[PDB]
Amino acid sequence: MKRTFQPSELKRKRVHGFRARMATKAGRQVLARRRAKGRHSLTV
Amino acid sequence: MNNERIYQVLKGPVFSEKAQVLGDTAGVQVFKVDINATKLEIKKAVEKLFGVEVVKVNTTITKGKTKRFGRTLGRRSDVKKAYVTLKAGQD
Amino acid sequence: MSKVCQVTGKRPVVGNNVSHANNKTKRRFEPNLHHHRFWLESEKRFVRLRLTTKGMRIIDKLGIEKVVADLRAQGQKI
Amino acid sequence: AKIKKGDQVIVIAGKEKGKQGTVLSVSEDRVKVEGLNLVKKHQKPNRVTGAEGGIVTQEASLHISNVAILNATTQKADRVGYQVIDGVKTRVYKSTGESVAVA
Amino acid sequence: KTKDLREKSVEELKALLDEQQLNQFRLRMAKATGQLGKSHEVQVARKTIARIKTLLTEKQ
RNA sequence: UGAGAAGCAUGCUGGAGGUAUCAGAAGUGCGAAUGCUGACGUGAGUAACGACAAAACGGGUGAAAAACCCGUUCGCCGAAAGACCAAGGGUUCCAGUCCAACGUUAAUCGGGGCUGGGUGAGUCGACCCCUAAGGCGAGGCCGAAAGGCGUAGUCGAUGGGA
RNA sequence: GAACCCACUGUCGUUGAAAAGCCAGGGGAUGACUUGUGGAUAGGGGUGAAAGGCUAAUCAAGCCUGGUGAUAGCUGGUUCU
RNA sequence: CUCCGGGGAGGCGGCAAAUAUCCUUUGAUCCGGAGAUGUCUGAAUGGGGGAACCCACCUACUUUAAGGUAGGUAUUGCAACAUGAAUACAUAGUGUUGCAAGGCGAACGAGGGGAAGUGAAACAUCUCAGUACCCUUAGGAAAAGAAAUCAAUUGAGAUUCCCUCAGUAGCGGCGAGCGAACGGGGAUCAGCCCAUUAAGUUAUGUGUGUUUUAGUGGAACGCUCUGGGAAGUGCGAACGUAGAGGGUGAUAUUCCCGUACACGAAAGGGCACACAUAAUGAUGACGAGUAGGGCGAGGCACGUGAAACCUUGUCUGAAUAUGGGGGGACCAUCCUCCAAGGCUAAAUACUCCUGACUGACCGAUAGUGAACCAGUACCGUGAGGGAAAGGCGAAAAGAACCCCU
Numbered sequence A: 001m002k003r004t005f006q007p008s009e010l011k012r013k014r015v016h017g018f019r020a021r022m023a024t025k026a027g028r029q030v031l032a033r034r035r036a037k038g039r040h041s042l043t044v
Numbered sequence B: 001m002n003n004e005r006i007y008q009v010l011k012g013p014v015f016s017e018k019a020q021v022l023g024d025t026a027g028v029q030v031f032k033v034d035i036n037a038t039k040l041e042i043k044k045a046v047e048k049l050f051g052v053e054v055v056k057v058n059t060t061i062t063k064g065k066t067k068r069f070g071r072t073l074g075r076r077s078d079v080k081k082a083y084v085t086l087k088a089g090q091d
Numbered sequence C: 001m002s003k004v005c006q007v008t009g010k011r012p013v014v015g016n017n018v019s020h021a022n023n024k025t026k027r028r029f030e031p032n033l034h035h036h037r038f039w040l041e042s043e044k045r046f047v048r049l050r051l052t053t054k055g056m057r058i059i060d061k062l063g064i065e066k067v068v069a070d071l072r073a074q075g076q077k078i
Numbered sequence D: 001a002k003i004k005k006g007d008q009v010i011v012i013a014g015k016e017k018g019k020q021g022t023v024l025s026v027s028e029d030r031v032k033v034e035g036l037n038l039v040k041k042h043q044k045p046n047r048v049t050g051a052e053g054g055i056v057t058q059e060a061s062l063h064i065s066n067v068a069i070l071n072a073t074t075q076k077a078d079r080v081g082y083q084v085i086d087g088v089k090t091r092v093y094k095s096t097g098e099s100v101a102v103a
Numbered sequence E: 001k002t003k004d005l006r007e008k009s010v011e012e013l014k015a016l017l018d019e020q021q022l023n024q025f026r027l028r029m030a031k032a033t034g035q036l037g038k039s040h041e042v043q044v045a046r047k048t049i050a051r052i053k054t055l056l057t058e059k060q
Numbered sequence F: 001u002g003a004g005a006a007g008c009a010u011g012c013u014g015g016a017g018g019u020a021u022c023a024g025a026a027g028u029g030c031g032a033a034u035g036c037u038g039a040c041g042u043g044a045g046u047a048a049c050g051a052c053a054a055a056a057c058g059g060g061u062g063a064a065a066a067a068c069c070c071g072u073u074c075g076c077c078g079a080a081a082g083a084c085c086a087a088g089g090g091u092u093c094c095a096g097u098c099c100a101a102c103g104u105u106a107a108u109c110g111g112g113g114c115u116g117g118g119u120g121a122g123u124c125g126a127c128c129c130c131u132a133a134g135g136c137g138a139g140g141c142c143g144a145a146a147g148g149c150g151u152a153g154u155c156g157a158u159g160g161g162a
Numbered sequence G: 001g002a003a004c005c006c007a008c009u010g011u012c013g014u015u016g017a018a019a020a021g022c023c024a025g026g027g028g029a030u031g032a033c034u035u036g037u038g039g040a041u042a043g044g045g046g047u048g049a050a051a052g053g054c055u056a057a058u059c060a061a062g063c064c065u066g067g068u069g070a071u072a073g074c075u076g077g078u079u080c081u
Numbered sequence H: 001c002u003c004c005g006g007g008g009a010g011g012c013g014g015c016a017a018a019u020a021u022c023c024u025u026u027g028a029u030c031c032g033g034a035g036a037u038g039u040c041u042g043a044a045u046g047g048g049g050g051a052a053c054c055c056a057c058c059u060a061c062u063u064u065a066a067g068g069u070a071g072g073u074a075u076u077g078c079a080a081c082a083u084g085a086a087u088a089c090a091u092a093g094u095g096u097u098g099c100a101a102g103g104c105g106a107a108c109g110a111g112g113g114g115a116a117g118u119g120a121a122a123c124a125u126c127u128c129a130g131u132a133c134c135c136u137u138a139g140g141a142a143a144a145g146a147a148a149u150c151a152a153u154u155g156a157g158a159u160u161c162c163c164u165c166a167g168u169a170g171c172g173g174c175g176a177g178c179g180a181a182c183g184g185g186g187a188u189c190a191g192c193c194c195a196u197u198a199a200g201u202u203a204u205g206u207g208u209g210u211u212u213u214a215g216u217g218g219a220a221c222g223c224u225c226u227g228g229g230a231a232g233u234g235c236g237a238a239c240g241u242a243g244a245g246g247g248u249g250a251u252a253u254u255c256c257c258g259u260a261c262a263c264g265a266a267a268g269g270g271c272a273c274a275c276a277u278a279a280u281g282a283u284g285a286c287g288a289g290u291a292g293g294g295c296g297a298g299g300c301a302c303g304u305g306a307a308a309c310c311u312u313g314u315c316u317g318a319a320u321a322u323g324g325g326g327g328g329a330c331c332a333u334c335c336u337c338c339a340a341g342g343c344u345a346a347a348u349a350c351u352c353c354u355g356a357c358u359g360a361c362c363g364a365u366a367g368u369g370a371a372c373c374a375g376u377a378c379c380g381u382g383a384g385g386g387a388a389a390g391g392c393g394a395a396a397a398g399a400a401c402c403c404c405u
């Protein structure tokens, strides 16, 4: 049966990407939190 | 195109059965080149530093392998190869 | 770009509605703002300002030229 | 104090206490002495280089604080101090104050 | 070598840099082919290239 | 040995710390909370080994062959169980070598470990020129702030252009 | 009436081959049709040929992090002589 | 990589041994200071974009082919200049140059908005609480501050913080709860101006003093017994302005590194005080749409109450030193102060970070989630969640060689 995850890299980058996060204040706060926690990879 | 870039364009020759057959049969040289080098750069570099006349250049890029030593992973760097065709019998 | 009076600086403030059973809910009080065109002789033109009726009372008492000079000195494009 | 690659030392602690020789190398806090502190090494032969293996005897390092410089005149263990003779620093024996013999 | 390197003019230094880069390329080719047993030649060529560029920046 | 929580002496193991007396302070005593973490039992050498398209023999190699290789027969698919492309994956592709772990059995075999190779374009595709839905948006209008919408523009293929 | 899209009956399966299937039958099959790529609508909100249906195996108010060690006149447990 | 200073025999960073080529007393490795170089993304700023990519233009030099070097090309605000509509003067608009800003980061400060779980043994006033959270924006601190203030013997004398007064006076479905001030004792102490204009502060240079970024010297122990090994037993000795600590084959003041103490800086940095130049303070010259009032709210311990006082959304509205504000409804008398203009150190709050030192704090299920290649493996579309895993030996001396397979 069809499952929930149907991967598409263009959609992945446009929804969860670095520039998408930079575009809004809440996304910049997300990036700040992840930098403070010390994640090795900030975004997808 | 300057001399400083000229001395960095080429890296070394390729030693393999395919390269050996190509050289022994069609007079084609195989070189490892800089990843950012272009065909015109390669042509001018070969012509200046080997005194032979180049007919055409073909290039290809091979991605590096990802493999493990012990408990850590690693990746090798990409390698760009150049197939340089010379005229008649040269080099 | 806001409900702010150019002449006096008034703006909405917050408060409470109070019912007969003393229930309190948040509200705001708004200024009596609106647009008005004033003839300015020194520059031969109409200047349009967003201001309150208290702003008009101040303009009536002091003159339009003095008020415009004060706003320009405060750094507004009038 | 100081102990360098050429001096004559005497072992003051360990299984080799009382013996003497010439130091071979100094590195960190370990020193090697000629003919002293020998070990038996079971060496496997090296396929690439041949050199069929066997049992060999070689020096092993001691702690640098287990050896003392030797005073030739009195043949006894001694400490090392520094003195500015003329305009240059030099090593001297604490007991007598004379200059330390060179290698 | 920087001592005697500093005792040369700008034009001499630039030429020296030119044959030094040429020599570095030649040594790289020789080592890649396997005709060079000693790599300190490559190391010192690199080092003097850096030295000449430093001295040129200082002198200009 | 003492009424008890417990104390004392000593054989073996172990290989560097322990601590009287009298005071002082507590992370001070566990069998249970369908308590928490790790290790190991019973069921039990029990059920099962994943489409009922199907296998048989000779030779080879090997420590070992029902499963690998070569050969001779038998059977199954054939609008897909064959041949391609996009998306997605990323070396799984080829050769040599190894069999501990992985493969629902063994394995000399492998999409497994190790070493070394391999992707060649003016014409194929992308990049590039053009725009749809839609997004962003100099000035601008609006909003306590953060911001909302939008003009000129600028992007955006699933479409047009050797 | 094939492909394709559905899901009416029965057997089996229920520590399954499968966290919704297989097999034998069944319905629509030029239309209010099926489908790829890319977009829009966001939680007392959305969307709904309307079942309180669906909104990432979660829905009479999604998920995550904070207030937060919420409160519990209730149940359990509470270690030497 | 370069220079300056230190230092004096080894060195070529770690996992991580071996090996090779080697460097170094013509002074290496190493330590401190000052310089040179410094790809691409990212506020990212030439345009665009799915971050680490795609596409450009203009100058100067260089090439003869299809390029190379360097510089420049964002927006907004301010200033100068130029140009310039409807529209005649003009203004709007447009461009060039020069200057400045944007982003990030622990806590503390100030300001704009602002809950509910809960308690009241139910619940709506009330509480929780101006707490959590969101937004804007400083500084090394911020804010406040020199009486239109309190007091009530006619006395005190700017602001801030701590101890009392006191769980008192009061507020309150007079419930649950909330909760002062006066006075007294301390910490620190400081005032100066409104157009000829002050104290103070910030930059720049000079001078003096201190501190800091490498380092140098630095005392004194032998014999014997046990033992694999002595620092341990037994016997005697020495230093102490040094008997802190760490290491060495078991427990060391006299073996090593050190310790007390005494010395030390080419060059650079901080702080302190004093001079010179800037600049600021400093659009402001005694305070009118202001004080006061009517209506609705908010703040004061104070919930409309006998409710003074402060702020203002709306409507109004004085006197102006023979004047005006306050003393908790209001009036009279007394006492006290002068609003509608400004600047100002200390005592106070905090720790992303740096150096030294300390613990009746933990010792691998503890202590940070993380002693180990941890915000990793792994889970999730995503925000996010989130582990397990320390110990051979003093020294590899890490088992040559033989046998089964």
Ligand SMILES: NCCC[C@H](N)CC(=O)N[C@@H]1[C@H](O)[C@@H](OC(N)=O)[C@@H](CO)O[C@H]1NC1=N[C@@H]2C(=O)NC[C@@H](O)[C@H]2N1
Binding pocket: C019, C020, C021, C022, H125, H303
């Ligand atoms: N601290 C909180 C006290 C709560 C009250 N006590 C509850 C109460 O008694 N409400 C009643 C009630 O709602 C109803 O009359 C009746 N009885 O049904 C109305 C009819 O006018 O009158 C209300 N009374 C008031 N309205 C006024 C107001 O809001 N402001 C001023 C003063 O006039 C207030 N008092």
